[PDB]
Amino acid sequence: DHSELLVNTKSGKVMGTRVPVLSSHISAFLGIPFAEPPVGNMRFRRPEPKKPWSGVWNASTYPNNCQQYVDEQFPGFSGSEMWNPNREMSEDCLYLNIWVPSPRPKSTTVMVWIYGGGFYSGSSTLDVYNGKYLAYTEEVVLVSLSYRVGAFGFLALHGSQEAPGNVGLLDQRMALQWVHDNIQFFGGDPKTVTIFGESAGGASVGMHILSPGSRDLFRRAILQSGSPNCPWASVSVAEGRRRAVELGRNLNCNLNSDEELIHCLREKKPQELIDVEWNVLPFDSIFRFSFVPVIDGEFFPTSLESMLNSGNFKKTQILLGVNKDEGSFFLLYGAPGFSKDSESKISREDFMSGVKLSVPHANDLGLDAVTLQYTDWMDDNNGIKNRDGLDDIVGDHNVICPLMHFVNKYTKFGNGTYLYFFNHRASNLVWPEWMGVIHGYEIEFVFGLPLVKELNYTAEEEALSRRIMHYWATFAKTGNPNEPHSQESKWPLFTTKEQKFIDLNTEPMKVHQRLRVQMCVFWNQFLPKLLNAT
Amino acid sequence: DHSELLVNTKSGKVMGTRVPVLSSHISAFLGIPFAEPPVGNMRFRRPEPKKPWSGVWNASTYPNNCQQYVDEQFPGFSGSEMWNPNREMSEDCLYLNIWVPSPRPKSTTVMVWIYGGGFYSGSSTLDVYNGKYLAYTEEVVLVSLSYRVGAFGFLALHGSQEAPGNVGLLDQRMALQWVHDNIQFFGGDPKTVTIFGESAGGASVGMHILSPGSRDLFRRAILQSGSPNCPWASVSVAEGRRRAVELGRNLNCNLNSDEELIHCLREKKPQELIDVEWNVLPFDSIFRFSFVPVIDGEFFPTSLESMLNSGNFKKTQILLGVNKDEGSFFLLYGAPGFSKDSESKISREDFMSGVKLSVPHANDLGLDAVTLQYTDWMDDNNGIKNRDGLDDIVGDHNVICPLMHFVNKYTKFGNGTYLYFFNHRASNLVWPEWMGVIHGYEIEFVFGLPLVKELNYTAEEEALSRRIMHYWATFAKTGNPNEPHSQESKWPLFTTKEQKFIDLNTEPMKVHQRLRVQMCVFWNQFLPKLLNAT
Ligand SMILES: *[C@@H]1O[C@H](CO)[C@@H](O[C@@H]2O[C@H](CO)[C@@H](O)[C@H](O)[C@H]2NC(C)=O)[C@H](O)[C@H]1NC(C)=O
Ligand SMILES: *[C@@H]1O[C@H](CO)[C@@H](O[C@@H]2O[C@H](CO)[C@@H](O)[C@H](O)[C@H]2NC(C)=O)[C@H](O)[C@H]1NC(C)=O
Ligand SMILES: *[C@@H]1O[C@H](CO)[C@@H](O)[C@H](O)[C@H]1NC(C)=O
Ligand SMILES: *[C@@H]1O[C@H](CO)[C@@H](O)[C@H](O)[C@H]1NC(C)=O
Ligand SMILES: C[C@@]12CCN[C@@H]1Nc1ccc(O)cc12
Ligand SMILES: C[C@@]12CCN[C@@H]1Nc1ccc(O)cc12
Ligand SMILES: [Cl-]
Ligand SMILES: [Cl-]
Ligand SMILES: [Cl-]
Ligand SMILES: [Cl-]
Ligand SMILES: [Cl-]
Numbered sequence A, B: 001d002h003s004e005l006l007v008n009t010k011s012g013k014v015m016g017t018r019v020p021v022l023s024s025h026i027s028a029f030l031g032i033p034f035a036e037p038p039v040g041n042m043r044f045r046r047p048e049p050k051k052p053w054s055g056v057w058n059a060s061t062y063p064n065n066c067q068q069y070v071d072e073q074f075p076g077f078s079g080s081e082m083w084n085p086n087r088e089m090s091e092d093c094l095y096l097n098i099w100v101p102s103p104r105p106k107s108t109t110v111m112v113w114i115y116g117g118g119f120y121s122g123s124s125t126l127d128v129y130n131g132k133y134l135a136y137t138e139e140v141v142l143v144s145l146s147y148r149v150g151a152f153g154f155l156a157l158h159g160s161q162e163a164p165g166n167v168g169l170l171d172q173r174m175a176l177q178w179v180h181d182n183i184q185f186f187g188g189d190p191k192t193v194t195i196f197g198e199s200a201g202g203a204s205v206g207m208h209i210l211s212p213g214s215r216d217l218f219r220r221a222i223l224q225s226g227s228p229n230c231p232w233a234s235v236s237v238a239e240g241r242r243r244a245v246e247l248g249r250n251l252n253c254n255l256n257s258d259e260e261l262i263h264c265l266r267e268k269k270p271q272e273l274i275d276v277e278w279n280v281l282p283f284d285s286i287f288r289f290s291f292v293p294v295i296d297g298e299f300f301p302t303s304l305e306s307m308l309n310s311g312n313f314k315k316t317q318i319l320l321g322v323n324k325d326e327g328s329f330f331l332l333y334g335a336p337g338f339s340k341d342s343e344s345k346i347s348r349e350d351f352m353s354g355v356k357l358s359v360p361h362a363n364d365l366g367l368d369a370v371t372l373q374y375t376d377w378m379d380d381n382n383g384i385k386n387r388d389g390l391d392d393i394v395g396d397h398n399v400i401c402p403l404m405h406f407v408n409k410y411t412k413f414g415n416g417t418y419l420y421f422f423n424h425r426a427s428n429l430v431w432p433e434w435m436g437v438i439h440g441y442e443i444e445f446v447f448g449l450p451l452v453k454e455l456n457y458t459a460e461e462e463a464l465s466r467r468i469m470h471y472w473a474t475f476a477k478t479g480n481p482n483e484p485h486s487q488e489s490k491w492p493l494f495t496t497k498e499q500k501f502i503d504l505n506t507e508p509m510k511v512h513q514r515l516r517v518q519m520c521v522f523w524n525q526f527l528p529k530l531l532n533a534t
């Protein structure tokens, strides 16, 4: 072993690059391969382990981003473009990135990031995901993986082995297997790996907790604005098949057999599958994505609900939470009456159009039930109330209530739960005020962007980012976000009985209980009973 | 014409009695017959007009009270005994009472009182109904009628003419016909008659507004805590028949034909029918009575809802309202966990037992819907919240929301609506504090008991009674409760658009809007759609 930027792993030697960070420096090994390129006849198939290489792998520059739908609703606007691929797109995209403190640690806490983006998009190379601030400030080895999204990672024709489904989840598991096998050479302790992600990434984290084939590969888990049981996170095998066939029908494919269909889908260039991706959804809806995990009986033994009830899952500690206005993004992009440069005050007619779009699987009784629940009939024509009420409908149904069901089911068997409610609106936010604390905007605090002066955050925001980075890192390290024997206020543990949680903002810590119970009893207990009876 | 206490009517001469009232005096003609005694083969039949008499009728003492169930839940307790018959009970009970100012007016405003008591009880002779205070203070001719209740006034075997149903309503209409024909001789103006009643009496008033055969007999209407469309106020002809047959089955009657059944029921003494009256209800329930008006296609042309929608009803002015805690009486008497001498804090189990009892016709989804709606899940085990929530369930479902539906349907076609919310708890109340402002306790203010010193009301309460007596009387007289060109605050008119109403207490008048819309949209629009779909 010669240099600090050279590391010999079980797959071959890797050469990194020194990176500047807050007046200091650390090491980064970017673009390390963990699977063979899922190209050609490999498209839609399970990932294959990367064949070991001779010589030295150049790990000094980020890798390609997986083929995905690109958002151009607001061309040039940073608010939306900070999420788009910032590297060239390619089906050859299964790589991982590692940020190592300097000098190289011997056996320190490890954190693996799993990006979100509704399983149809996402990149490990985004600026808000730069792990050098976290690695540096908290001295953890920070890993960020990648995984096939869209049809590429989730086209599902159950029964077939050419496109069984969930391969994007299997891509994640292989990156986690590689971390388990090689993170030691980078100074990481494979027995103290914490996986964390946001949105589809948080749902993924929860899916690795559930899937028996993934449990042994990590120690602890953090989930941000995502839960495995989210209504948009999975589909039955019948629906997945139905959508795969419909995708084929959009490309004038032969539909006589799975082989015919799959072969045809494999002959198409990437952008061709992406171009008709959204045409397969079964309803006019928001917060619904075409290709997602399928409850196959393999990666997922049984229905998610029976697994949560039987305690059929990994038991450990978890730290999770949600943002105050999870729904605003999805209404801005597809609900009538909402627009980026307007206060978007909503009319009674658009409110109702929005309820229909938000609970696509509901019948009329169900739609009325929802409307009754979120309408102030003492002032039903208040455009701001209609807007905010619709925002909460989308956030409660799609993120918060599903996470609260998961939190409650998990706590009965887990070894420690820490729940947070993130409600701070960034001072340099480019989105309109009506969107509030947006889906995905706690991430910048988790990765420490506020400590970077040029980004223009207030001093209190830098403080908030530090507390957060330290809660996350201390939790990953010990199973508890609080410092042992500290003076600071204690984030209390979430219990079945007390159900406490804390707010996460620039104000002095404050503890609360039963996060949105009223609305969540509606969403998790009532509405489903109603839909199953009618 | 010789004396002030002697009056010659179209039915014969009547002799009254001078009565003392607040240091002064007035005349009272008590026990005037308006129908032939519905005795013997007359039981269950339509009322027959009283055959004119020779000589002078002694109208100096109250008449008998109709045969009815007598309440002995709290023997000796005034709170419950002030509602029980205070005269001997008899099937010979169709009489009316008149209080005439002195000196006798020539043609003044007339008010006719229709007592309540769920159509199974009630008397025109109760102390809280003494009309001398109102007649005196407001100089109106005050009439109080009587009508058969229980099986006697509402046994219904549609198709038959021996017991067609609604005869108790027909008893009321005949008393109103007699007032139309003879009130002139007592100084009353038959063209300015206002009918008013509480509970079943208020529902009756609304039924006379609906029934084309009753409309021409009165000018205006006042309804207190009752509405024709209340869930307990009527039954289909099938259900009435079903209950009449079940009553017969309780007395070991022959059930082969209506004639057999009716003849048998006619051979039984009164107390025998009363003794098994409650055994015919179809569900374990509260706020439900055995024999009530039937939607027969005669007195009621069509369903109450289609009549309200088509505007098929008398168009005039109406003044109506409800009390703050309508449900407490019915929970005290039959819901588990409630008792007279306890604070009655309710357990989650009794709350649920109570929901079942309160919405007897509901399936499980419906029961859950109700529970979800009235449960504070942030503190579901608060015994006081469970108690009060259950109180509102009973009041909203049985009185307030049905009245608000009626108010809204009526206003689209009426000539003026005045709505009130009575929320003052009497200072000398003998019932426990948890019952609040009880069903039936605004009556004592409407009849002016507070002006009687010996009854122990505060000075402010005497003031409240006077404003109320004067709103009622001024409304009966002109169609508007407000004084023309007055300094006092104005009770605004209730409109389809603004929906304003006022509170009625000892505080300075205050106007509000949309009385209990949130809960009433639930009860009037949502729940029924839910029950009709499931
Ligand atoms: C997490 O699991 C640990 C170990 O399974 C729990 O610690 C045990 O707690 C019981 C009760 O105090 C003791 O009898 C054992 O000796 C403990 N083991 C050790 C090594 O500490 C711990 O209580 C669990 N924590 C939570 C929040 O459930
Ligand atoms: C109650 O009815 C009366 C009479 O039908 C209404 O009075 C009429 O109002 C219109 C509009 O102002 C006038 O053109 C008529 O000349 C009025 N008639 C009389 C004799 O006043 C009155 O508006 C109605 N009130 C309510 C509250 O609906
Ligand atoms: C590593 O590869 C990148 C590819 O563009 C190149 O820019 C860089 O100079 C290379 N470094 C070495 C030592 O190969
Ligand atoms: C009227 O009848 C009642 C019946 O008890 C009696 O007390 C009263 O004295 C009678 N008066 C006359 C004049 O008949
Ligand atoms: C990761 C993000 C945050 C918002 N921008 C990115 N795009 C997207 C789409 C869906 C989702 O749930 C989450 C996301
Ligand atoms: C008239 C009263 C007021 C409470 N005491 C009398 N009894 C009774 C029963 C039912 C009802 O709706 C109303 C009543
Ligand atoms: Cl920097
Ligand atoms: Cl779903
Ligand atoms: Cl096929
Ligand atoms: Cl489709
Ligand atoms: Cl859309």
Ligand SMILES: [Cl-]
Binding pocket: A404, A405, A408, A524
């Ligand atoms: Cl739950």
Ligand SMILES: [Cl-]
Binding pocket: A404, A405, A408, A520, A524
């Ligand atoms: Cl929950």
Ligand SMILES: [Cl-]
Binding pocket: A079, A428, A429, A430, A431
């Ligand atoms: Cl921003």
Ligand SMILES: [Cl-]
Binding pocket: A429, A430, A431, A432, A433
């Ligand atoms: Cl802005």
Ligand SMILES: [Cl-]
Binding pocket: A444, A449, A455
């Ligand atoms: Cl930023």
Ligand SMILES: [Cl-]
Binding pocket: A404, A405, A516, A517, A520, A521
């Ligand atoms: Cl909940």
Ligand SMILES: [Cl-]
Binding pocket: B020, B021, B022, B023, B452
């Ligand atoms: Cl007196």
Ligand SMILES: [Cl-]
Binding pocket: B231, B232, B361
């Ligand atoms: Cl009903």
Ligand SMILES: [Cl-]
Binding pocket: B245, B255, B256, B257, B258, B261
């Ligand atoms: Cl019969």
Ligand SMILES: [Cl-]
Binding pocket: B246, B279, B280, B281, B282
């Ligand atoms: Cl029965």
Ligand SMILES: [Cl-]
Binding pocket: B285, B286, B333, B334
């Ligand atoms: Cl009962």
Ligand SMILES: [Cl-]
Binding pocket: B404, B405, B408, B524
């Ligand atoms: Cl209504």
Ligand SMILES: [Cl-]
Binding pocket: B404, B405, B408, B520, B524
């Ligand atoms: Cl209404």
Ligand SMILES: [Cl-]
Binding pocket: B079, B428, B429, B430, B431
């Ligand atoms: Cl009292």
Ligand SMILES: [Cl-]
Binding pocket: B429, B430, B431, B432, B433
């Ligand atoms: Cl008391």
Ligand SMILES: [Cl-]
Binding pocket: B444, B449, B455
């Ligand atoms: Cl009294």
